[PDB]
Symmetry: D2
Subunit: 217 residues, 4 copies
């Protein structure tokens, strides 16, 4: 058993949003089978960020999803060999982000490398004007396809002037070696910002995530 009750992770992101380049480094920890993890991030280059932190938050840890016995945990089964994931986030005002990540296990610690490109965000929009107030709790729809696991989520960012800012997530989870695939199921998640300095250069996050079948099934 390579995925222990307690596992630590290191994450590094290299990104670009509306032409602004940045680098983020971080360290995280959590309980893989209990469905929760924390992460501490630091902007190492391109700081302070001229956009909302919230668009970066869901990109900083697959192995921390609590899965019941009957639904195979594809993401956990991918280790020690390796794991990769990719995502497209379609924002309602035209913004589009594509993310690609590489996950490896080195000496009982997960190493995550994230590449992020965000484009077409309006200048007067909530992302560029930093008007977002965190994510609402979400429900991902997962299904197997092409030998990999795919997920779709209808997410929303809370606005300070009131209301929501809609984002559609489409994710593809790829194990290095094709491991056991689950059926049609759901993953409930909730990401919260627990700490931050004034310009969001140092941020701490907490995520709660649990996989399940549909309530009627």
């Amino acid at each position: 058993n390579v995925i222990k009750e307690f596992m630590r992770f290191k994450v590094r992101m290299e990104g670009t949003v509306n032409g602004h380049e940045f680098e983020i480094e971080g360290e995280g920890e959590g309980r893989p089978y209990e469905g929760h993890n924390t992460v501490k991030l630091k902007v190492t280059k391109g700081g302070p960020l001229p956009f909302a932190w919230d668009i970066l938050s869901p990109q900083f840890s697959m192995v921390y999803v609590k899965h019941p016995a009957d639904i195979p945990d594809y993401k956990k089964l991918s280790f020690p060999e390796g794991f990769k994931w990719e995502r497209v986030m379609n924002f309602e005002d035209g913004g589009v982000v594509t993310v690609t990540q590489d996950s490896s296990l080195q000496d009982g610690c997960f190493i995550y490398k994230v590449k992020f490109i965000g484009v077409n965000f309006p200048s007067d929009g909530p992302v560029m004007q930093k008007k977002t107030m965190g994510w609402e709790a979400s429900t991902e729809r997962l299904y197997p396809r092409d030998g990999v696991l795919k997920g779709e989520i209808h997410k929303a960012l809370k606005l300070k002037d009131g209301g929501h800012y809609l984002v559609e997530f489409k994710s593809i989870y790829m194990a290095k070696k094709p491991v056991q695939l689950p059926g049609y199921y759901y993953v409930d998640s909730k990401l919260d910002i627990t700490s931050h300095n004034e310009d969001y250069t140092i941020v701490e996050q907490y995520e709660r995530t649990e996989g399940r079948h549909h309530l009627f099934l």
Copy 2:
């Protein structure tokens, strides 16, 4: 209270899919507060349909969703005045459908009028070739906006040879008179075809729908 423990409904649909016109008439019944309803449909014109019945199934009854005390039931509160709903269904192979519906309570019985336009479906596709095997159970994400209630769902049609055919639903629920709006919540649903003749000209359906808050809230 005009919405009783047992309510009946009449449905009338006028539609077009890939240039083929059709008319469907139906009668249904159910328990509004327990979250379940049945409906018997008959194709009255344009029969037999040269496409999958499944794309028409979710268009045939908002008042039948079980809601807990804490979440305002916008759809039930819209009566006896009136209710209207609109929807766009985006299929993964390019097929797009827009639906518009009118709802009124005429002497303890609901009268539903539906208009449907389906376009851009590939000729060798699962809808036109009738390769679908019913909907998977789903979870709608709802939120208030512009004084009305909106909802989005990531749905899927089961395929005969195995696999899924993805469809994204975006619905807008409009009360005639601006009634109380709920917050950010979810609606679980499961629609099943319970009876049908060989050419799907006489079809019976069953649906169970329940509104709830996110599991982590």
Copy 3:
């Protein structure tokens, strides 16, 4: 023989936008081989319209596109048998419209029946607030697929306070009998409102449309 140098048409539209139902009747005329036509419309029911006329304008005449000798005029060749077309218009603020039309030739005059459903237009938007100032001239991209002719356009509505309101058009042109298909080509078009009363219940339009190959070929 059937498509004369001068041809007239009658059009009837039954529609719905954001729950509001309407009916429009009109008469038109033009020169098929010269690439121009005029049309006089009148709102017969649901008047005055609570939205911008501009979204309806491109739905009111395929046979009037000038084509050079080397490019097969699919739409003209579909007659006297029949023609049908479908369309989806995706607006940048979430508005979606699907249109379906049936074209017939009776008594030496074309008869057009249009069904229109418009959904998800924000209440504070330029369509519902009537802030649009006509269409910009456009260029459609056409290609054959599934035995029919398809077309895609990146169109824009001029704004009153300045700027543009973007709309993506995806059309499907279907002959009743499988007629000769053209290759990958373009159709330049410009639609102008030439006359209108205050509430847009009586409107006149003019369209110039010409088919051609890409200029670098």
Copy 4:
């Protein structure tokens, strides 16, 4: 006057498609005011590429677009100060790519740095199975918005059997210093692969691009 009749460029691309990382280096040349340029590429890492070269080809030179005297050449006027461009490519089978590029002028030679992330491409699709055979000639629709220039194109990749693979391009052109903006206009382009080795590790391209007003103006 910093942009001469003959200008050379160096290009470097760091990218990822369906999890596969790659690095491409190249050198090109052309005549800015005449509207044509050539480029010689070499895959330096991640070679041989397990996907179609054609999706990379339009990412390898804004200053080589011929513009008439009346339409301001935003991209040429961006120099010596600098220029940046971003793009999203939406493929019809689900594939999404976001591109971000930085353009500088160093000692009479243009330096281009490109970052590419391609996600959600089907394993059995024409991109991953290398079944595409070049781009069709295209027409871009440009318009000013938020102090920058934006452009939309309906492009197509030719398929080996005798069909097309559709891709929608949405580009954003950003000068470092807010320079003169043009109006609503078009850019015709034609990209051809002129030379390639067996595995597409060494490729040569040619592009012809000209800006113009709509033909009906």
